[PDB]
Amino acid sequence: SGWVWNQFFVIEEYTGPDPVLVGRLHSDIDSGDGNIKYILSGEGAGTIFVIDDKSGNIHATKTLDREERAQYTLMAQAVDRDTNRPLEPPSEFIVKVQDINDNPPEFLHEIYHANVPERSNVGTSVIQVTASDADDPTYGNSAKLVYSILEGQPYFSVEAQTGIIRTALPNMDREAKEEYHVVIQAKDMGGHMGGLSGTTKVTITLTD
Amino acid sequence: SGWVWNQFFVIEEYTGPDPVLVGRLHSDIDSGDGNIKYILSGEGAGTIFVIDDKSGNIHATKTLDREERAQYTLMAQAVDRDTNRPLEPPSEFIVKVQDINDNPPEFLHEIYHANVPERSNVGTSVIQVTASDADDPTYGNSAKLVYSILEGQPYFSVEAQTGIIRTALPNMDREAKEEYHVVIQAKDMGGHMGGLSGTTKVTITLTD
Ligand SMILES: [Ca+2]
Ligand SMILES: [Ca+2]
Ligand SMILES: [Ca+2]
Ligand SMILES: [Ca+2]
Ligand SMILES: [Ca+2]
Ligand SMILES: [Ca+2]
Protein backbone atom coordinates (compact mmCIF):
# COMPACT_ATOMS: atom_id res chain seq x y z
CA SER A 1 0.00 0.00 0.00
CA GLY A 2 1.44 3.27 -1.27
CA TRP A 3 4.65 1.42 -2.16
CA VAL A 4 4.67 -0.19 -5.63
CA TRP A 5 6.11 -3.70 -5.75
CA ASN A 6 4.64 -5.46 -8.79
CA GLN A 7 7.50 -5.42 -11.22
CA PHE A 8 10.27 -7.86 -11.77
CA PHE A 9 13.81 -7.50 -13.04
CA VAL A 10 15.83 -9.81 -15.27
CA ILE A 11 19.51 -9.48 -16.01
CA GLU A 12 19.93 -9.54 -19.79
CA GLU A 13 22.33 -11.79 -21.74
CA TYR A 14 22.32 -14.55 -19.07
CA THR A 15 23.93 -17.69 -20.51
CA GLY A 16 24.47 -19.88 -17.46
CA PRO A 17 22.80 -23.32 -17.67
CA ASP A 18 20.01 -22.88 -15.10
CA PRO A 19 16.96 -20.63 -15.80
CA VAL A 20 16.72 -17.23 -14.13
CA LEU A 21 13.97 -16.95 -11.61
CA VAL A 22 12.18 -13.76 -12.68
CA GLY A 23 9.78 -13.50 -9.73
CA ARG A 24 6.81 -15.31 -8.21
CA LEU A 25 3.05 -14.83 -8.20
CA HIS A 26 1.79 -15.49 -4.68
CA SER A 27 -1.40 -14.85 -2.74
CA ASP A 28 -1.77 -14.02 0.91
CA ILE A 29 -4.43 -16.77 1.39
CA ASP A 30 -1.92 -19.32 0.08
CA SER A 31 -1.02 -21.41 3.12
CA GLY A 32 1.14 -23.20 0.54
CA ASP A 33 -0.96 -26.31 0.97
CA GLY A 34 -1.27 -26.54 -2.81
CA ASN A 35 -4.98 -25.97 -3.45
CA ILE A 36 -4.11 -22.88 -5.44
CA LYS A 37 -3.28 -22.79 -9.11
CA TYR A 38 -1.49 -19.77 -10.51
CA ILE A 39 -1.94 -18.70 -14.14
CA LEU A 40 0.18 -16.37 -16.27
CA SER A 41 -1.06 -14.68 -19.48
CA GLY A 42 0.45 -11.80 -21.51
CA GLU A 43 3.64 -11.05 -23.51
CA GLY A 44 6.17 -13.90 -23.73
CA ALA A 45 3.99 -15.73 -21.25
CA GLY A 46 4.31 -19.38 -22.24
CA THR A 47 7.19 -18.63 -24.58
CA ILE A 48 9.88 -16.65 -22.70
CA PHE A 49 8.18 -16.80 -19.29
CA VAL A 50 6.94 -19.92 -17.74
CA ILE A 51 5.23 -20.53 -14.43
CA ASP A 52 5.10 -23.45 -12.00
CA ASP A 53 1.40 -23.43 -11.10
CA LYS A 54 1.90 -24.62 -7.46
CA SER A 55 4.93 -22.56 -6.45
CA GLY A 56 3.88 -19.73 -8.75
CA ASN A 57 7.52 -19.26 -9.79
CA ILE A 58 8.14 -17.51 -13.14
CA HIS A 59 11.42 -18.36 -14.93
CA ALA A 60 13.06 -17.03 -18.03
CA THR A 61 13.37 -19.73 -20.72
CA LYS A 62 15.68 -17.67 -23.05
CA THR A 63 18.71 -15.45 -22.97
CA LEU A 64 17.14 -11.98 -23.29
CA ASP A 65 18.65 -9.01 -25.16
CA ARG A 66 17.53 -5.84 -23.43
CA GLU A 67 18.48 -4.11 -26.68
CA GLU A 68 15.51 -6.00 -28.31
CA ARG A 69 12.90 -5.67 -25.58
CA ALA A 70 13.12 -3.78 -22.31
CA GLN A 71 9.70 -4.77 -21.01
CA TYR A 72 6.95 -7.32 -20.92
CA THR A 73 3.53 -6.73 -19.37
CA LEU A 74 2.10 -9.96 -17.97
CA MET A 75 -1.16 -10.92 -16.25
CA ALA A 76 -1.38 -12.90 -13.04
CA GLN A 77 -4.37 -15.10 -12.11
CA ALA A 78 -4.94 -17.40 -9.19
CA VAL A 79 -7.78 -19.88 -9.11
CA ASP A 80 -8.83 -22.37 -6.50
CA ARG A 81 -7.65 -25.79 -7.66
CA ASP A 82 -10.92 -27.47 -6.39
CA THR A 83 -13.82 -24.93 -6.95
CA ASN A 84 -11.93 -23.41 -9.88
CA ARG A 85 -13.22 -20.00 -8.76
CA PRO A 86 -10.67 -17.19 -8.76
CA LEU A 87 -8.96 -16.38 -5.48
CA GLU A 88 -7.49 -13.00 -6.51
CA PRO A 89 -8.69 -10.72 -9.19
CA PRO A 90 -6.42 -10.84 -12.22
CA SER A 91 -3.70 -8.15 -12.19
CA GLU A 92 -0.97 -6.86 -14.49
CA PHE A 93 2.72 -6.60 -13.75
CA ILE A 94 5.79 -5.83 -15.86
CA VAL A 95 9.06 -7.63 -16.11
CA LYS A 96 11.85 -5.27 -17.07
CA VAL A 97 15.00 -6.59 -18.66
CA GLN A 98 17.92 -5.05 -16.71
CA ASP A 99 20.52 -3.49 -18.98
CA ILE A 100 24.06 -4.89 -19.08
CA ASN A 101 26.95 -3.06 -20.62
CA ASP A 102 27.46 -5.09 -23.78
CA ASN A 103 27.85 -2.34 -26.32
CA PRO A 104 30.89 -0.12 -26.74
CA PRO A 105 30.41 3.60 -27.53
CA GLU A 106 30.63 4.34 -31.26
CA PHE A 107 31.43 7.67 -33.00
CA LEU A 108 28.95 9.05 -35.55
CA HIS A 109 31.75 9.34 -38.14
CA GLU A 110 35.22 8.03 -37.32
CA ILE A 111 36.96 10.86 -39.19
CA TYR A 112 35.82 14.38 -38.56
CA HIS A 113 37.00 17.41 -40.56
CA ALA A 114 37.21 20.60 -38.59
CA ASN A 115 38.74 24.02 -39.09
CA VAL A 116 39.49 27.00 -36.85
CA PRO A 117 41.06 30.49 -37.35
CA GLU A 118 44.86 30.87 -36.93
CA ARG A 119 45.24 33.19 -33.99
CA SER A 120 42.06 32.12 -32.10
CA ASN A 121 42.08 32.57 -28.35
CA VAL A 122 42.58 29.58 -26.08
CA GLY A 123 39.10 28.19 -25.48
CA THR A 124 37.66 28.85 -28.96
CA SER A 125 35.57 25.84 -30.07
CA VAL A 126 36.53 23.75 -33.13
CA ILE A 127 33.93 20.92 -33.36
CA GLN A 128 31.31 18.88 -31.40
CA VAL A 129 32.02 15.16 -31.55
CA THR A 130 29.58 12.60 -30.29
CA ALA A 131 29.42 8.88 -29.77
CA SER A 132 26.11 6.98 -29.83
CA ASP A 133 26.07 4.07 -27.38
CA ALA A 134 23.69 1.21 -27.92
CA ASP A 135 22.95 0.41 -24.24
CA ASP A 136 20.30 1.94 -21.94
CA PRO A 137 20.75 5.70 -21.43
CA THR A 138 17.68 5.58 -19.18
CA TYR A 139 18.68 3.04 -16.49
CA GLY A 140 22.33 2.20 -16.30
CA ASN A 141 25.43 4.17 -17.13
CA SER A 142 26.72 1.62 -19.61
CA ALA A 143 25.59 4.60 -21.67
CA LYS A 144 27.13 7.46 -19.67
CA LEU A 145 29.94 8.54 -21.97
CA VAL A 146 33.08 10.48 -21.07
CA TYR A 147 35.31 12.14 -23.71
CA SER A 148 39.11 12.27 -23.39
CA ILE A 149 41.71 13.65 -25.81
CA LEU A 150 44.18 10.99 -26.75
CA GLU A 151 46.35 12.53 -29.48
CA GLY A 152 46.48 16.26 -30.19
CA GLN A 153 47.45 17.85 -26.91
CA PRO A 154 48.76 20.29 -25.85
CA TYR A 155 47.26 21.91 -28.88
CA PHE A 156 43.57 21.27 -28.22
CA SER A 157 41.21 20.15 -25.46
CA VAL A 158 37.94 18.26 -25.31
CA GLU A 159 35.02 18.95 -23.00
CA ALA A 160 34.52 15.97 -20.64
CA GLN A 161 30.81 15.43 -21.34
CA THR A 162 29.92 17.70 -24.21
CA GLY A 163 32.61 16.21 -26.49
CA ILE A 164 33.48 19.65 -27.87
CA ILE A 165 37.03 20.24 -28.99
CA ARG A 166 38.42 23.69 -28.35
CA THR A 167 41.82 25.28 -29.01
CA ALA A 168 44.00 25.31 -25.91
CA LEU A 169 47.06 27.38 -26.72
CA PRO A 170 47.54 31.10 -27.48
CA ASN A 171 49.27 32.63 -30.49
CA MET A 172 48.89 29.60 -32.70
CA ASP A 173 50.30 31.20 -35.86
CA ARG A 174 49.53 29.03 -38.99
CA GLU A 175 53.05 28.83 -40.56
CA ALA A 176 53.84 26.48 -37.65
CA LYS A 177 51.96 23.22 -38.64
CA GLU A 178 49.99 22.49 -41.88
CA GLU A 179 46.96 20.44 -40.56
CA TYR A 180 46.53 19.12 -36.99
CA HIS A 181 45.64 15.45 -36.25
CA VAL A 182 43.69 14.79 -33.06
CA VAL A 183 42.20 11.60 -31.61
CA ILE A 184 39.22 11.68 -29.21
CA GLN A 185 38.15 8.70 -27.01
CA ALA A 186 34.63 8.04 -25.66
CA LYS A 187 34.22 5.71 -22.66
CA ASP A 188 31.28 3.86 -21.01
CA MET A 189 30.36 4.04 -17.46
CA GLY A 190 31.27 7.62 -16.84
CA GLY A 191 34.65 6.28 -17.97
CA HIS A 192 35.39 4.15 -14.89
CA MET A 193 37.55 1.07 -14.47
CA GLY A 194 35.82 -1.39 -16.83
CA GLY A 195 33.97 0.91 -19.24
CA LEU A 196 33.97 -0.08 -22.91
CA SER A 197 35.30 2.57 -25.37
CA GLY A 198 35.71 3.85 -28.91
CA THR A 199 37.59 6.56 -30.71
CA THR A 200 37.68 8.84 -33.72
CA LYS A 201 40.10 11.17 -35.43
CA VAL A 202 39.48 14.83 -36.07
CA THR A 203 41.65 16.53 -38.68
CA ILE A 204 41.88 20.27 -38.15
CA THR A 205 42.89 23.05 -40.52
CA LEU A 206 43.95 26.42 -39.04
CA THR A 207 42.34 28.96 -41.36
CA ASP A 208 44.12 32.21 -42.14
CA SER B 1 -4.04 -6.11 -2.93
CA GLY B 2 -4.51 -9.79 -2.14
CA TRP B 3 -1.50 -10.57 -4.35
CA VAL B 4 1.88 -10.40 -2.57
CA TRP B 5 4.62 -8.65 -4.54
CA ASN B 6 7.20 -7.37 -2.04
CA GLN B 7 10.02 -9.81 -2.44
CA PHE B 8 12.96 -9.78 -4.75
CA PHE B 9 15.06 -12.52 -6.28
CA VAL B 10 18.79 -12.65 -6.92
CA ILE B 11 20.59 -15.29 -8.91
CA GLU B 12 23.43 -16.61 -6.75
CA GLU B 13 27.09 -16.93 -7.82
CA TYR B 14 26.86 -14.06 -10.36
CA THR B 15 30.38 -13.08 -11.48
CA GLY B 16 29.76 -10.86 -14.49
CA PRO B 17 31.28 -7.36 -14.21
CA ASP B 18 28.10 -5.27 -13.80
CA PRO B 19 26.03 -5.36 -10.55
CA VAL B 20 22.75 -7.28 -10.47
CA LEU B 21 19.72 -5.11 -10.11
CA VAL B 22 17.87 -6.76 -7.22
CA GLY B 23 14.68 -4.66 -7.40
CA ARG B 24 13.50 -1.10 -6.84
CA LEU B 25 11.69 0.77 -4.09
CA HIS B 26 9.13 3.05 -5.69
CA SER B 27 6.12 5.04 -4.55
CA ASP B 28 2.92 5.71 -6.42
CA ILE B 29 3.14 9.49 -5.69
CA ASP B 30 6.58 9.53 -7.34
CA SER B 31 6.06 11.46 -10.57
CA GLY B 32 9.79 10.76 -10.93
CA ASP B 33 10.48 14.47 -10.66
CA GLY B 34 13.14 13.70 -8.04
CA ASN B 35 11.76 15.28 -4.87
CA ILE B 36 11.67 11.87 -3.27
CA LYS B 37 14.51 10.22 -1.42
CA TYR B 38 14.42 6.48 -0.87
CA ILE B 39 16.13 4.88 2.13
CA LEU B 40 17.09 1.25 2.72
CA SER B 41 17.83 -0.23 6.18
CA GLY B 42 18.16 -3.89 7.30
CA GLU B 43 20.38 -6.93 6.61
CA GLY B 44 23.24 -6.36 4.14
CA ALA B 45 21.72 -2.96 3.51
CA GLY B 46 24.70 -0.71 2.85
CA THR B 47 27.05 -3.67 2.58
CA ILE B 48 25.64 -6.19 0.06
CA PHE B 49 22.67 -4.07 -1.02
CA VAL B 50 22.94 -0.53 -2.08
CA ILE B 51 20.30 1.91 -3.23
CA ASP B 52 20.28 4.90 -5.58
CA ASP B 53 18.16 7.34 -3.59
CA LYS B 54 16.52 9.01 -6.65
CA SER B 55 15.81 5.97 -8.82
CA GLY B 56 15.32 3.79 -5.75
CA ASN B 57 17.23 0.98 -7.48
CA ILE B 58 18.79 -1.69 -5.21
CA HIS B 59 21.85 -3.52 -6.59
CA ALA B 60 23.89 -6.41 -5.32
CA THR B 61 27.49 -5.36 -4.58
CA LYS B 62 28.82 -8.96 -4.06
CA THR B 63 28.67 -12.40 -5.57
CA LEU B 64 26.21 -14.16 -3.24
CA ASP B 65 26.36 -17.84 -2.20
CA ARG B 66 22.83 -19.04 -1.61
CA GLU B 67 24.45 -21.85 0.36
CA GLU B 68 25.51 -19.16 2.94
CA ARG B 69 22.36 -17.05 3.08
CA ALA B 70 19.05 -17.64 1.35
CA GLN B 71 17.35 -14.49 2.60
CA TYR B 72 17.70 -10.92 3.70
CA THR B 73 14.89 -8.87 5.26
CA LEU B 74 15.25 -5.20 4.38
CA MET B 75 13.31 -2.04 5.26
CA ALA B 76 12.16 0.53 2.74
CA GLN B 77 11.61 4.22 3.56
CA ALA B 78 10.70 7.14 1.38
CA VAL B 79 10.98 10.71 2.58
CA ASP B 80 10.21 13.97 0.87
CA ARG B 81 13.51 15.49 -0.20
CA ASP B 82 12.31 19.06 0.76
CA THR B 83 10.03 18.71 3.90
CA ASN B 84 11.94 15.58 4.94
CA ARG B 85 8.62 14.13 6.11
CA PRO B 86 7.98 10.51 5.16
CA LEU B 87 5.89 9.86 2.06
CA GLU B 88 5.20 6.15 2.71
CA PRO B 89 5.24 4.36 5.97
CA PRO B 90 8.34 2.21 6.33
CA SER B 91 7.81 -1.41 5.20
CA GLU B 92 9.76 -4.67 5.17
CA PHE B 93 10.56 -6.83 2.20
CA ILE B 94 12.82 -9.86 1.65
CA VAL B 95 15.37 -10.52 -1.00
CA LYS B 96 15.76 -14.23 -1.63
CA VAL B 97 18.92 -15.57 -3.18
CA GLN B 98 17.81 -17.88 -6.03
CA ASP B 99 19.52 -21.26 -5.91
CA ILE B 100 21.84 -22.34 -8.73
CA ASN B 101 23.00 -25.88 -9.20
CA ASP B 102 26.61 -25.58 -8.09
CA ASN B 103 26.91 -28.63 -5.90
CA PRO B 104 27.11 -32.22 -7.09
CA PRO B 105 25.27 -34.96 -5.14
CA GLU B 106 27.52 -36.74 -2.65
CA PHE B 107 27.08 -40.22 -1.09
CA LEU B 108 27.05 -40.55 2.72
CA HIS B 109 29.81 -43.18 2.54
CA GLU B 110 31.40 -44.02 -0.80
CA ILE B 111 31.73 -47.72 0.03
CA TYR B 112 28.75 -49.50 1.46
CA HIS B 113 28.83 -53.06 2.83
CA ALA B 114 25.64 -54.99 2.34
CA ASN B 115 24.58 -58.61 2.61
CA VAL B 116 21.55 -60.63 1.50
CA PRO B 117 20.47 -64.32 1.77
CA GLU B 118 21.47 -66.73 -1.05
CA ARG B 119 18.20 -67.83 -2.55
CA SER B 120 16.24 -64.58 -1.87
CA ASN B 121 13.35 -63.83 -4.20
CA VAL B 122 13.75 -61.21 -6.91
CA GLY B 123 12.75 -57.93 -5.28
CA THR B 124 14.22 -58.60 -1.82
CA SER B 125 15.93 -55.44 -0.53
CA VAL B 126 19.69 -55.34 0.18
CA ILE B 127 20.49 -51.75 1.31
CA GLN B 128 19.28 -48.08 1.27
CA VAL B 129 21.87 -45.76 -0.23
CA THR B 130 21.52 -42.02 -0.11
CA ALA B 131 23.30 -38.99 -1.43
CA SER B 132 23.14 -35.62 0.36
CA ASP B 133 23.14 -32.69 -2.07
CA ALA B 134 24.25 -29.30 -0.90
CA ASP B 135 21.86 -27.17 -3.02
CA ASP B 136 18.29 -26.07 -2.22
CA PRO B 137 15.88 -29.01 -1.76
CA THR B 138 13.15 -26.44 -1.11
CA TYR B 139 13.18 -24.33 -4.32
CA GLY B 140 15.00 -25.81 -7.24
CA ASN B 141 15.67 -29.37 -8.28
CA SER B 142 19.43 -28.95 -8.32
CA ALA B 143 18.65 -31.12 -5.30
CA LYS B 144 16.17 -33.59 -6.84
CA LEU B 145 18.27 -36.73 -6.98
CA VAL B 146 17.75 -39.79 -9.19
CA TYR B 147 19.51 -43.14 -8.53
CA SER B 148 20.73 -45.39 -11.36
CA ILE B 149 22.65 -48.68 -11.19
CA LEU B 150 25.88 -48.42 -13.09
CA GLU B 151 27.74 -51.67 -12.37
CA GLY B 152 26.07 -54.75 -10.90
CA GLN B 153 23.24 -55.55 -13.24
CA PRO B 154 21.57 -57.84 -14.12
CA TYR B 155 22.12 -59.06 -10.62
CA PHE B 156 20.56 -56.20 -8.67
CA SER B 157 18.35 -53.15 -9.15
CA VAL B 158 18.05 -49.75 -7.52
CA GLU B 159 14.86 -47.86 -6.79
CA ALA B 160 14.78 -44.63 -8.86
CA GLN B 161 14.09 -42.23 -5.97
CA THR B 162 14.39 -44.25 -2.80
CA GLY B 163 17.95 -45.40 -3.64
CA ILE B 164 17.23 -48.91 -2.33
CA ILE B 165 19.08 -51.78 -3.90
CA ARG B 166 17.15 -55.00 -4.27
CA THR B 167 18.03 -58.40 -5.74
CA ALA B 168 16.74 -58.80 -9.28
CA LEU B 169 17.30 -62.40 -10.28
CA PRO B 170 15.82 -65.70 -9.02
CA ASN B 171 17.70 -68.76 -7.81
CA MET B 172 20.89 -66.92 -7.00
CA ASP B 173 22.72 -69.89 -5.45
CA ARG B 174 25.88 -68.73 -3.52
CA GLU B 175 28.50 -71.13 -5.01
CA ALA B 176 28.18 -68.97 -8.15
CA LYS B 177 30.05 -65.71 -7.15
CA GLU B 178 31.96 -64.95 -3.88
CA GLU B 179 31.03 -61.23 -3.23
CA TYR B 180 29.15 -58.93 -5.65
CA HIS B 181 30.45 -55.44 -6.59
CA VAL B 182 27.83 -52.84 -7.50
CA VAL B 183 28.10 -49.14 -8.35
CA ILE B 184 25.19 -46.72 -7.81
CA GLN B 185 24.99 -43.21 -9.38
CA ALA B 186 23.02 -40.23 -8.00
CA LYS B 187 22.14 -37.36 -10.36
CA ASP B 188 20.91 -33.75 -9.92
CA MET B 189 17.96 -32.29 -11.54
CA GLY B 190 15.77 -35.32 -11.53
CA GLY B 191 18.71 -36.65 -13.54
CA HIS B 192 18.12 -34.59 -16.70
CA MET B 193 20.51 -33.43 -19.40
CA GLY B 194 22.92 -31.27 -17.37
CA GLY B 195 22.50 -32.60 -13.82
CA LEU B 196 25.65 -32.94 -11.72
CA SER B 197 26.33 -36.44 -10.27
CA GLY B 198 28.21 -38.69 -7.87
CA THR B 199 28.61 -42.37 -7.21
CA THR B 200 29.40 -45.02 -4.64
CA LYS B 201 30.19 -48.71 -4.52
CA VAL B 202 28.21 -51.27 -2.59
CA THR B 203 29.90 -54.60 -1.90
CA ILE B 204 27.41 -57.38 -1.30
CA THR B 205 27.83 -60.76 0.35
CA LEU B 206 25.22 -63.47 -0.35
CA THR B 207 24.68 -65.11 3.03
CA ASP B 208 24.02 -68.84 3.26
CA1 LIG C 1 22.32 -6.88 -25.09
CA1 LIG D 1 22.80 -3.76 -22.88
CA1 LIG E 1 27.86 0.86 -23.58
CA1 LIG F 1 26.52 -21.59 -4.17
CA1 LIG G 1 23.32 -23.56 -5.04
CA1 LIG H 1 23.10 -30.23 -6.74
Side-chain angles (χ1 to χ4, degrees), chain A residues 12-13 64-68 99-103 135:
Chain A
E12 136 213 37
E13 244 67 291
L64 298 173
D65 179 33
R66 120 93 225 336
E67 270 52 72
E68 300 206 308
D99 175 59
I100 225 186
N101 188 9
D102 50 344
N103 300 254
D135 295 287

PDB file of all heavy atoms in Angstrom, chain A residues 12-13 64-68 99-103 135, ligand 1:
ATOM      1  N   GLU A  12      19.879  -9.188 -18.380  1.00  0.00           N
ATOM      2  CA  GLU A  12      19.927  -9.544 -19.786  1.00  0.00           C
ATOM      3  C   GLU A  12      21.193 -10.347 -20.105  1.00  0.00           C
ATOM      4  O   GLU A  12      22.147 -10.382 -19.302  1.00  0.00           O
ATOM      5  CB  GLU A  12      19.839  -8.258 -20.605  1.00  0.00           C
ATOM      6  CG  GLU A  12      20.800  -8.132 -21.772  1.00  0.00           C
ATOM      7  CD  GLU A  12      21.252  -6.704 -22.018  1.00  0.00           C
ATOM      8  OE1 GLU A  12      21.447  -5.966 -21.032  1.00  0.00           O
ATOM      9  OE2 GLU A  12      21.424  -6.322 -23.196  1.00  0.00           O
ATOM     10  N   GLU A  13      21.188 -11.013 -21.262  1.00  0.00           N
ATOM     11  CA  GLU A  13      22.334 -11.787 -21.739  1.00  0.00           C
ATOM     12  C   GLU A  13      22.850 -12.856 -20.758  1.00  0.00           C
ATOM     13  O   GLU A  13      24.053 -13.133 -20.725  1.00  0.00           O
ATOM     14  CB  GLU A  13      23.473 -10.847 -22.144  1.00  0.00           C
ATOM     15  CG  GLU A  13      23.847 -10.887 -23.618  1.00  0.00           C
ATOM     16  CD  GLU A  13      22.759 -10.361 -24.517  1.00  0.00           C
ATOM     17  OE1 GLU A  13      21.708 -11.034 -24.617  1.00  0.00           O
ATOM     18  OE2 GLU A  13      22.958  -9.286 -25.130  1.00  0.00           O
ATOM     19  N   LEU A  64      17.858 -13.173 -22.841  1.00  0.00           N
ATOM     20  CA  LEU A  64      17.141 -11.985 -23.289  1.00  0.00           C
ATOM     21  C   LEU A  64      18.088 -10.853 -23.689  1.00  0.00           C
ATOM     22  O   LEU A  64      19.062 -10.599 -22.993  1.00  0.00           O
ATOM     23  CB  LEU A  64      16.265 -11.496 -22.152  1.00  0.00           C
ATOM     24  CG  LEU A  64      15.174 -12.428 -21.639  1.00  0.00           C
ATOM     25  CD1 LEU A  64      14.522 -11.817 -20.374  1.00  0.00           C
ATOM     26  CD2 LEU A  64      14.161 -12.674 -22.755  1.00  0.00           C
ATOM     27  N   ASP A  65      17.819 -10.164 -24.793  1.00  0.00           N
ATOM     28  CA  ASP A  65      18.650  -9.013 -25.163  1.00  0.00           C
ATOM     29  C   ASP A  65      17.898  -7.724 -24.918  1.00  0.00           C
ATOM     30  O   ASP A  65      16.971  -7.400 -25.667  1.00  0.00           O
ATOM     31  CB  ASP A  65      19.100  -9.078 -26.623  1.00  0.00           C
ATOM     32  CG  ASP A  65      19.936  -7.868 -27.034  1.00  0.00           C
ATOM     33  OD1 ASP A  65      20.683  -7.319 -26.195  1.00  0.00           O
ATOM     34  OD2 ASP A  65      19.853  -7.461 -28.208  1.00  0.00           O
ATOM     35  N   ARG A  66      18.315  -6.982 -23.886  1.00  0.00           N
ATOM     36  CA  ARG A  66      17.534  -5.842 -23.434  1.00  0.00           C
ATOM     37  C   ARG A  66      17.514  -4.806 -24.522  1.00  0.00           C
ATOM     38  O   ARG A  66      16.643  -3.954 -24.546  1.00  0.00           O
ATOM     39  CB  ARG A  66      17.997  -5.306 -22.072  1.00  0.00           C
ATOM     40  CG  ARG A  66      18.475  -3.872 -22.017  1.00  0.00           C
ATOM     41  CD  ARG A  66      17.399  -2.848 -21.643  1.00  0.00           C
ATOM     42  NE  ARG A  66      17.467  -1.663 -22.519  1.00  0.00           N
ATOM     43  CZ  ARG A  66      18.552  -1.236 -23.189  1.00  0.00           C
ATOM     44  NH1 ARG A  66      19.729  -1.853 -23.070  1.00  0.00           N
ATOM     45  NH2 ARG A  66      18.478  -0.161 -23.966  1.00  0.00           N
ATOM     46  N   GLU A  67      18.452  -4.932 -25.454  1.00  0.00           N
ATOM     47  CA  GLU A  67      18.479  -4.113 -26.676  1.00  0.00           C
ATOM     48  C   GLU A  67      17.250  -4.339 -27.563  1.00  0.00           C
ATOM     49  O   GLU A  67      16.796  -3.407 -28.210  1.00  0.00           O
ATOM     50  CB  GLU A  67      19.767  -4.375 -27.460  1.00  0.00           C
ATOM     51  CG  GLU A  67      20.938  -3.469 -27.097  1.00  0.00           C
ATOM     52  CD  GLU A  67      21.262  -3.416 -25.610  1.00  0.00           C
ATOM     53  OE1 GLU A  67      21.798  -4.402 -25.070  1.00  0.00           O
ATOM     54  OE2 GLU A  67      20.993  -2.374 -24.980  1.00  0.00           O
ATOM     55  N   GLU A  68      16.719  -5.577 -27.555  1.00  0.00           N
ATOM     56  CA  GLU A  68      15.507  -6.000 -28.312  1.00  0.00           C
ATOM     57  C   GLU A  68      14.178  -5.699 -27.634  1.00  0.00           C
ATOM     58  O   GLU A  68      13.218  -5.317 -28.295  1.00  0.00           O
ATOM     59  CB  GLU A  68      15.509  -7.501 -28.531  1.00  0.00           C
ATOM     60  CG  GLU A  68      16.674  -8.035 -29.306  1.00  0.00           C
ATOM     61  CD  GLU A  68      16.336  -9.348 -30.014  1.00  0.00           C
ATOM     62  OE1 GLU A  68      15.825 -10.306 -29.353  1.00  0.00           O
ATOM     63  OE2 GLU A  68      16.591  -9.403 -31.250  1.00  0.00           O
ATOM     64  N   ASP A  99      19.455  -3.700 -18.008  1.00  0.00           N
ATOM     65  CA  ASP A  99      20.521  -3.490 -18.980  1.00  0.00           C
ATOM     66  C   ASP A  99      21.882  -3.933 -18.437  1.00  0.00           C
ATOM     67  O   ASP A  99      22.159  -3.830 -17.250  1.00  0.00           O
ATOM     68  CB  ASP A  99      20.518  -2.027 -19.464  1.00  0.00           C
ATOM     69  CG  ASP A  99      21.690  -1.689 -20.390  1.00  0.00           C
ATOM     70  OD1 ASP A  99      21.830  -2.334 -21.470  1.00  0.00           O
ATOM     71  OD2 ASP A  99      22.447  -0.749 -20.010  1.00  0.00           O
ATOM     72  N   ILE A 100      22.691  -4.472 -19.337  1.00  0.00           N
ATOM     73  CA  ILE A 100      24.058  -4.888 -19.075  1.00  0.00           C
ATOM     74  C   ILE A 100      24.871  -4.078 -20.050  1.00  0.00           C
ATOM     75  O   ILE A 100      24.364  -3.685 -21.110  1.00  0.00           O
ATOM     76  CB  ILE A 100      24.238  -6.401 -19.370  1.00  0.00           C
ATOM     77  CG1 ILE A 100      25.009  -7.058 -18.261  1.00  0.00           C
ATOM     78  CG2 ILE A 100      24.905  -6.709 -20.741  1.00  0.00           C
ATOM     79  CD1 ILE A 100      25.335  -8.523 -18.583  1.00  0.00           C
ATOM     80  N   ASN A 101      26.124  -3.823 -19.718  1.00  0.00           N
ATOM     81  CA  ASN A 101      26.949  -3.057 -20.622  1.00  0.00           C
ATOM     82  C   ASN A 101      27.590  -3.942 -21.671  1.00  0.00           C
ATOM     83  O   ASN A 101      28.709  -4.375 -21.496  1.00  0.00           O
ATOM     84  CB  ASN A 101      28.015  -2.314 -19.846  1.00  0.00           C
ATOM     85  CG  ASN A 101      28.767  -1.363 -20.706  1.00  0.00           C
ATOM     86  OD1 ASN A 101      28.394  -1.126 -21.858  1.00  0.00           O
ATOM     87  ND2 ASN A 101      29.832  -0.793 -20.166  1.00  0.00           N
ATOM     88  N   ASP A 102      26.892  -4.219 -22.761  1.00  0.00           N
ATOM     89  CA  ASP A 102      27.458  -5.095 -23.778  1.00  0.00           C
ATOM     90  C   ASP A 102      27.673  -4.397 -25.117  1.00  0.00           C
ATOM     91  O   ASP A 102      27.917  -5.035 -26.140  1.00  0.00           O
ATOM     92  CB  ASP A 102      26.612  -6.353 -23.956  1.00  0.00           C
ATOM     93  CG  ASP A 102      25.139  -6.061 -24.142  1.00  0.00           C
ATOM     94  OD1 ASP A 102      24.655  -4.945 -23.854  1.00  0.00           O
ATOM     95  OD2 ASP A 102      24.443  -6.994 -24.561  1.00  0.00           O
ATOM     96  N   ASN A 103      27.586  -3.079 -25.115  1.00  0.00           N
ATOM     97  CA  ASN A 103      27.854  -2.335 -26.317  1.00  0.00           C
ATOM     98  C   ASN A 103      28.898  -1.268 -26.042  1.00  0.00           C
ATOM     99  O   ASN A 103      28.838  -0.590 -25.003  1.00  0.00           O
ATOM    100  CB  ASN A 103      26.567  -1.722 -26.857  1.00  0.00           C
ATOM    101  CG  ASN A 103      25.532  -2.761 -27.189  1.00  0.00           C
ATOM    102  OD1 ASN A 103      25.290  -3.050 -28.351  1.00  0.00           O
ATOM    103  ND2 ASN A 103      24.916  -3.337 -26.166  1.00  0.00           N
ATOM    104  N   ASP A 135      23.547   0.834 -25.502  1.00  0.00           N
ATOM    105  CA  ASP A 135      22.948   0.410 -24.242  1.00  0.00           C
ATOM    106  C   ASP A 135      21.933   1.402 -23.729  1.00  0.00           C
ATOM    107  O   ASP A 135      21.643   2.361 -24.398  1.00  0.00           O
ATOM    108  CB  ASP A 135      24.038   0.231 -23.208  1.00  0.00           C
ATOM    109  CG  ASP A 135      24.974  -0.888 -23.559  1.00  0.00           C
ATOM    110  OD1 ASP A 135      24.574  -2.064 -23.435  1.00  0.00           O
ATOM    111  OD2 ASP A 135      26.116  -0.594 -23.961  1.00  0.00           O
TER     112      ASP A 135
HETATM  113 CA    CA C   1      22.317  -6.877 -25.092  1.00  0.00          CA
END
